[PDB]
Symmetry: C4
Subunit: 96 residues, 4 copies
């Protein structure tokens, strides 16, 4: 019925697994700033929402490969979460 929660679960899984694997892939490259889990979790949100401020980004092969998975899986899931919120909002747009 409300599979929007299932897409929300998949989004949180991508945000958590992405931030965990990013720190795992970035530690080892001199100059890398995506090397601590707390700020790496907000980087996953920056990538999945496509906002991308640029304060945090990968600079390694794997780290950028992890970002690709966060892009493909996160933007799709976040697009499904924000689409359900759009449908619900219209459902009251006529109950004026």
């Amino acid at each position: 019925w409300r599979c929007a929660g299932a897409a929300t679960v998949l989004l949180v899984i991508v945000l958590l697994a992405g931030s965990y694997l990013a720190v795992l892939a970035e530690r080892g490259a001199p100059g890398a700033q995506l090397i601590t889990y707390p700020r790496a979790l907000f980087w996953s949100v920056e990538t999945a929402t496509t906002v991308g401020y640029g304060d945090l980004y990968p600079v390694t092969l794997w780290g950028r490969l992890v970002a690709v998975v966060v892009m493909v899986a996160g933007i799709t899931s976040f697009g499904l979460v924000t689409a359900a919120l759009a449908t619900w909002f219209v459902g009251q747009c006529q109950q004026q």
Copy 2:
């Protein structure tokens, strides 16, 4: 009928409340640049539209949590505002 104004109202509420709570959450962290309301209002627009230049961004736990609300609520509402503008434009695309 034209609930596009209702989504526009929700967008302005998210832009204003987001910029107000961001300054409230960022003041206190040394090095924070999102600490004045006027430029924080344009940061809300940068986030809601997903453009994200990167000249302004939060660096605190709460400030980033405020950004998440601006992302979830702002991108959904701005997506509804820009979708209604798209529909209206097509309505004249055949009145050539």
Copy 3:
């Protein structure tokens, strides 16, 4: 019929008028880098497509107001241009 060209015309108008008014609004503020028309035209593309690298952005009240018009009018028109390209691509996706 192919109103996609009409949305393409509106996009070019927003890109040109936006880059012209941005330079007009940014010149006068010390430190502004969006002050020449050639690179301001690519800034309009960065904003309308929502990519937003961050190498160029407004720092004035009007300049940021011009960016809002480029966001509202440009993302809507570019969304219509890229949607027609998507429909056309599917039209051959079954002429295998």
Copy 4:
């Protein structure tokens, strides 16, 4: 049937051809950082997904023209790849 692979092929072609032509267009301008193929390939992903961190961007006329092609062709194709992933996910959203 599953033309999603065809849009995926077009995306990879735009990512590869875009990163190849970007290095070809950027080498020659002092200060250009998009001058090696490996990191230019991730720049194509940053542009096509619209994330745009800002660590890499063109600064030449042609290089920015190449970016426009990566924007028009890449965002359209990546939008088709992520839309098929969204449809497939809903197909199991009711096989609970």
